[PDB]
Curated annotation (Swiss-Prot), chains A, B:
The chain holds residues 3264 to 3567 of 7096 of the full protein. This is 3C-like proteinase nsp5. There is a cross-link at residues 5, 90 (Glycyl lysine isopeptide (Lys-Gly) (interchain with G-Cter in ubiquitin)). It comes from Severe acute respiratory syndrome coronavirus 2. Residues 1-304 form the Peptidase C30 domain. Inhibited by pyridone-containing alpha-ketoamides compounds 13a and 13b. In turn, alpha-ketoamide 13b (tert-butyl (1-((S)-1-(((S)-4-(benzylamino)-3,4-dioxo-1-((S)-2-oxopyrrolidin-3-yl)butan-2-yl)amino)-3-cyclopropyl-1-oxopropan-2-yl)-2-oxo-1,2-dihydropyridin-3-yl)carbamate) inhibits SARS-CoV-2 replication in human lung cells. Inhibited ex vivo by michael acceptor inhibitor N3. Inhibited ex vivo by compound 11a and 11b. Residues 1-304 are cytoplasmic. It catalyses: TSAVLQ-|-SGFRK-NH2 and SGVTFQ-|-GKFKK the two peptides corresponding to the two self-cleavage sites of the SARS 3C-like proteinase are the two most reactive peptide substrates. The enzyme exhibits a strong preference for substrates containing Gln at P1 position and Leu at P2 position. Cleaves the C-terminus of replicase polyprotein at 11 sites. Recognizes substrates containing the core sequence [ILMVF]-Q-|-[SGACN]. Cleaves and inactivates human TRMT1, preventing tRNA guanine(26)-dimethylation of tRNAs. May cleave human NLRP1 in lung epithelial cells, thereby activating the NLRP1 inflammasome pathway. May cleave human GSDMD, triggering alternative GSDME-mediated epithelial cell death upon activation of the NLRP1 inflammasome, which may enhance the release interleukins 1B, 6, 16 and 18. Also able to bind an ADP-ribose-1''-phosphate (ADRP). Changing residue 49 to A: Does not affect ability to cleave and inactivate human TRMT1. The active site is at residues 41, 145. 3CL-PRO exists as monomer and homodimer. Only the homodimer shows catalytic activity. Interacts with host FBXO22; this interaction promotes the proteasomal degradation of nsp5.
Amino acid sequence: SGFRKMAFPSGKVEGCMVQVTCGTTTLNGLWLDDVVYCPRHVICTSEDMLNPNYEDLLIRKSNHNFLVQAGNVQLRVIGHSMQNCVLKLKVDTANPKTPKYKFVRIQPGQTFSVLACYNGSPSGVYQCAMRPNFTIKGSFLNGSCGSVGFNIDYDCVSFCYMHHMELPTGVHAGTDLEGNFYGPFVDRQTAQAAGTDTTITVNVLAWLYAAVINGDRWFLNRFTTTLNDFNLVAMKYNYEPLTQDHVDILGPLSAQTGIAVLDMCASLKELLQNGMNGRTILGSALLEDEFTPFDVVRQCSGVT
Amino acid sequence: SGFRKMAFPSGKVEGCMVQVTCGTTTLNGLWLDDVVYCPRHVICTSEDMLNPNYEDLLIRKSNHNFLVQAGNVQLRVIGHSMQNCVLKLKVDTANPKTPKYKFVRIQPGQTFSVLACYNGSPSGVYQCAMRPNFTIKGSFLNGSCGSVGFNIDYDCVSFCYMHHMELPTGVHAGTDLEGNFYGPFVDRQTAQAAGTDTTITVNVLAWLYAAVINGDRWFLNRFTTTLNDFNLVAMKYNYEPLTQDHVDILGPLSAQTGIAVLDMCASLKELLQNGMNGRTILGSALLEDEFTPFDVVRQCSGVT
Ligand SMILES: Cc1ccncc1NC(=O)[C@H]1C[C@H](C2CC2)C1
Ligand SMILES: Cc1ccncc1NC(=O)[C@H]1C[C@H](C2CC2)C1
């Protein structure tokens, strides 16, 4: 028992972190096979970041200008290319610590772990969720760019995120491992405002099932609702609309606890309308939305 | 910016996790140098756990009864001994992945990361705090015993905890790496109730400084207090008494923000007396006490 914001073990990702320096900017790179992946804004100076033309900036850069260091040893750069907002540095040595890996572009609502890094060195690991406005509420300082987000299925690491920037509101923006930004953000020092940060309804429900499984049941009520009635309530409180796809994914949790999905929606509805009244659920005084139904099943079953 | 419940990177600890089987019980072991550390209750059967005599139980066990497997390879056991509530299995091979390490017995209020494991395999990593009642609010299922708690200083892993049991209240109990239980708990299937779980005052204050550093300032007030006045309030709300030692450790945070420690205590006092009034601090609707002043400084500076 006990329910925690758990991140994946980070060892397989630690073995891929390298430091990339270009000119006077140092950030993190991801070394997989003979390729180092890093944010293309590594080639920018402070003046360049206001309105950068990456194609023009990259012309003045050669393989020897990109300094890649893994631990205390230097990697020889034999090729460089730009793929959207990421640079791919072909090195002459394949990373001996390369795990089985995939590059996946996640959907908003999905969760992942972040290995925050500085100068190619890991500082910590935490669990995140891609917000419905395509931002992440991370913990990143200057030098953390190139830190990656990932999920693990037994031995395979699915890289889903690479950190690029902090918006003026302190929230974070970045790309998948193909260089495409999540959301409408661009890698430029310009004010870009985030859209409405709605709550991930299916995740809150999965977390409510995790609470029932672990003993916290006070919020269970004698009511039920319909998908349309629930969604009227969800709209009012800036919750994501729940679909039958979301109900389908909650199926294993509904089966284990014996509480029908719509019954849990009615409990969630009363919680939205009345609040917690000074009480807590899983040691939290607010409704947690950064546990997917898969994370709840994984944690409550002990998947390694 | 952004403030997250961050765990240490777990790679160095993943390389030490092994599976230990004795008879029909399988749990986790920690392989450092040529020694495997695991909970001594691995030698117990269900009937034994009610009132076990570990010295008597250990007499009927030989080196060959302890099956140690690291990944898919078997370790040869050449010695076994009991040190308090942990068994030390001398193996003929030193762990090639042994990091620089120390065994430390932490004080309540101190935080650490837990690499939850099942069958010698890591499932996840989360941040914990040793509660003032010597329990931990973890996330552990059957098979997770032997999972360890640790902190990291650059390259040195300080092992501070080894998981042993779940109390009937769903909270967790365990030992330091010398086999001594934190608190008054014994490794026996008997009801053992936890003491008052007070809030770690110095940690809440450190988290309030982290909130000011990251933009959340609404809770700052025009008041101040004294250590004795604050402690009257802290006693009422089951908060740990604050000492000048705690004030000393908050010094770097007080210096960075320019908010005197006692001024922050007055803000905390008003928060205890009035509540959050539906507001949040660092995305939390309750006062977080599992960030030490050291964790706040580390995260807010980017220590790797
Ligand atoms: C200062 C900081 C903190 C956290 N995360 C990231 C950063 N860095 C940035 O946001 C910088 C590089 C960005 C360029 C437009 C691409 C501006
Ligand atoms: C079932 C479980 C779940 C989480 N953590 C731990 C456990 N296991 C236990 O508490 C068992 C082994 C204990 C023996 C008295 C020493 C009883």
